[PDB]
Amino acid sequence: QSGPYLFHDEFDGPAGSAPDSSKWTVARAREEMKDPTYWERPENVGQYRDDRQNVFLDGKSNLVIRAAKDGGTYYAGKIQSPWRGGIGHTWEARIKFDCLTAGCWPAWWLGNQDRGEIDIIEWYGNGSWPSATTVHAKANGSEWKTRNVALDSGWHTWRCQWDETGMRFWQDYAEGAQPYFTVAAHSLPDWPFNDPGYTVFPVLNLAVAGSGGGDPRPGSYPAQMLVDWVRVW
Ligand SMILES: [Mg+2]
Ligand SMILES: [Mg+2]
Numbered sequence: 001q002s003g004p005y006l007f008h009d010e011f012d013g014p015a016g017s018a019p020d021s022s023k024w025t026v027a028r029a030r031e032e033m034k035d036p037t038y039w040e041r042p043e044n045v046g047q048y049r050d051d052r053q054n055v056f057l058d059g060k061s062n063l064v065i066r067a068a069k070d071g072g073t074y075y076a077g078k079i080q081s082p083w084r085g086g087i088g089h090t091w092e093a094r095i096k097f098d099c100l101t102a103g104c105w106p107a108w109w110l111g112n113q114d115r116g117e118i119d120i121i122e123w124y125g126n127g128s129w130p131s132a133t134t135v136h137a138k139a140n141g142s143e144w145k146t147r148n149v150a151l152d153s154g155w156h157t158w159r160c161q162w163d164e165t166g167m168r169f170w171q172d173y174a175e176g177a178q179p180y181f182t183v184a185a186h187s188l189p190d191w192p193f194n195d196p197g198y199t200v201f202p203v204l205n206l207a208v209a210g211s212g213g214g215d216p217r218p219g220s221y222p223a224q225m226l227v228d229w230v231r232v233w
Contacts, residue, residue, distance in 0.1 A: 001030065001090070001231070001233070003231065003233055004232070004233070005231050005232055005233050006085055006089060006232045006233055007023075007081065007083045007202070007230070007231075007232040008229060008231040008232065009023045009024070009063075009168065009212070009227060009229060009230050010056075010061060010161065010228070011057055011061055011062050011063045011122045011227060011229060012061050013057045013059070013079075014057070014059050015056075015057065015058055015060075016052060016056055016057070016199075017056060017057040017059075018052065018056065018057070019048060019055060019056075019057065019079055023081055023083065024079040024080065024081055025079065025080055025081070025082060026048075026050035026055050026077065026078070026079055027048035027049075027050070027077065027078035027079070027080065027205070028048065028049060028050050029047065029048055029049075030045055030046060030047050030048050030207070030210070032035045033045070033210065033211075037211065039126070039209040039211065039213065039214050039215065040209075040210050040211055044209055045208075045209050045210050046067065046074040046075065046076050046103070046207055046208025046210065046213060046216070047074065047075050047076075047208075047211045048064055048071075048075070048076060048077055048078050048156060048205075048207075049075050049077070050077075050097070051075070052068075053066065053068070053070075053075075054066050054067070054075050054076055054077040054131055055078075055079060056067070058226070060134065061229075062095070062096075062226040062227060062228050062229050063079070063204065063226065063227040063228075064224050064225070064226055065077040065078070065079075065105050065106075065200040065204065065205065065206040065224065065225045065227075066206075066222055066223070066224045067099060067104060067206050067221060067222060067223045067224070068221050068222035068223075069221055073105070074175075074208040074209065074216060074221070075208075076104075076205075076206045076207060077205065077206060078203065078204070078205035078206075078207070079203070079204050079205070080201060080202070080203045081112070081201050081203075081230075082201065083201060083202070083204050084199035084200060084201045085199055085201075085232055086197070086198065086199045087162060087163060087198065087201060088134055088160060088162075088163050088164065089162065089163075089232055089233060090160070090161045090162075090232070090233055091110060091120070091159065091160045091161075091162065091180045091202065091230075091231075091232050092156075092157055092158065092160070092173070092230070092231050092232075093157070093158050093195065093202075093204070093225050093227055093229065093230045093231075094156070094157045094158060094227065094228040094229050095108060095109050095121075095122070095155070095157075095158060095212075095225065095226065095228075096122060096153065096154065096155045096156075096225070096226040096227075096228075097143035097151060097152075097225055098153055098223060098224045098225065098226065099155055099206055099224055099225050100123055100125075100129060100151060100152075100153055101107050101125060101214060101220045101221070101223050102125050102126075102214070102217070102218035102219035103125045103206070103208050103209055103213050103214060103215060103216025103217070103218070103219040103221075104123070104125040104206060104208060104214060104219060104223055105122070105123070105124055105125055105126075105146065105206070105207040105208065105209075105212040105213035106122065106123055106157055106205065106206045106207070106211060106223075106225045107121070107122040107123075107203070107204070107205055107207075108120045108121050108203070108204055108227075109122065109202075109203050110162070110200035110201065110202055110203070111200060111201050111203050112192070112198070112199070112200050112201075114139065114192075115137065115138065115139050115190075116135075116136060116137060116192040116193055116198070116200070117134075117135070117136040117191040118135055118137070118160055118162065118167060118200060119132070119133060119134040119136070119143070120133060120158050120159075120169065121133055121149060121151070121158045122134070122150050122212070123205050124212045124213070124214075125208075125212070125213045125216070125219060126211070126212055126213060126214025126215070127214055127215070127216055127218075128209060128214070129212060130148045131148065131149055131150070131151045131201035132146050132148045132149055133146065133149055133169050133180075133181050134147075134189070135145040135149050135167055135183045136188075137188035137189060137190060137191055137192060138188075138189070138190065141231030143188045143190075144188070145183045145187060145206035146151075147169075147180065147181035149171070149180065150161060155169055155228075156172050157170075157171070157172055157173060158170075158171060159171075161179075162193070162200075163205055164185060164194060165184070165185055166182060166184040166185040166187070166193075167181075167182065167183040167193075168181070168182045168183075169181045169182070194216045202230055202232070204225070204227055204230070205215065206223075206224075206225045
């Protein structure tokens with residue numbers, strides 16, 4: 001866990017800095033949702049923009065993703081690395097969720113363009129869905145293994161070891177610790193992760209509204225997610 005790293009960002013630099021553009025691309029728009037339900041409609045959904053008001057470094061070694069209303073619209077943020085990694089590595093981020101409020105939908109996850117998703121941790125502000133770690137096999141998202149995870153606003157590390165045997169997850173890993181969830185390889189239909197050449201990219205985001213965020217009006221904004229580092233080894 002001390003490296004050397006295949007990929008890392010320590011998010012160091014002065015307050016108000018952009019994240020390192022050699023490691024991240026900042027989202028400029030929320031993913032459009034076909035046949036939107038109420039909180040997914042264009043007029044209700046939270047947006048993403050590359051604006052230092054929403055995605056910036058705090059000068060204390062953290063990425064800040066900040067959700068806030070600006071002229072009738074909630075804006076927040078997402079960063080995704082162009083860097084992709086294959087099977088057989090460990091992926092970890094140190095995160096503080098100061099955004100566990102109605103409407104928010106933060107996540108730390110590993111993505112793929114075509115099939116498969118590893119949601120290392122995610123919280124739902126909609127008032128209905130439980131915070132959880134989830135592995136998805138199908139693009140529809142509709143085949144998954146999930147485990148609910150109790151979340152607070154403290155600092156924690158969130159680790160996924162993704163190797164040929166599957167995925168193992170830890171919160172606040174320390175020597176000898178037991179994963180809180182394990183997903184066996186080949187345990188979902190058309191499991192994609194063991195395919196030769198399959199890769200994932202790291203993503204950090206704080207969304208507002210949409211399906212998972214729901215109504216932000218009961219929430220308290222601005223709200224933030226802090227990330228001290230992402231490390232892959
Ligand atoms: Mg690789
Ligand atoms: Mg840091």
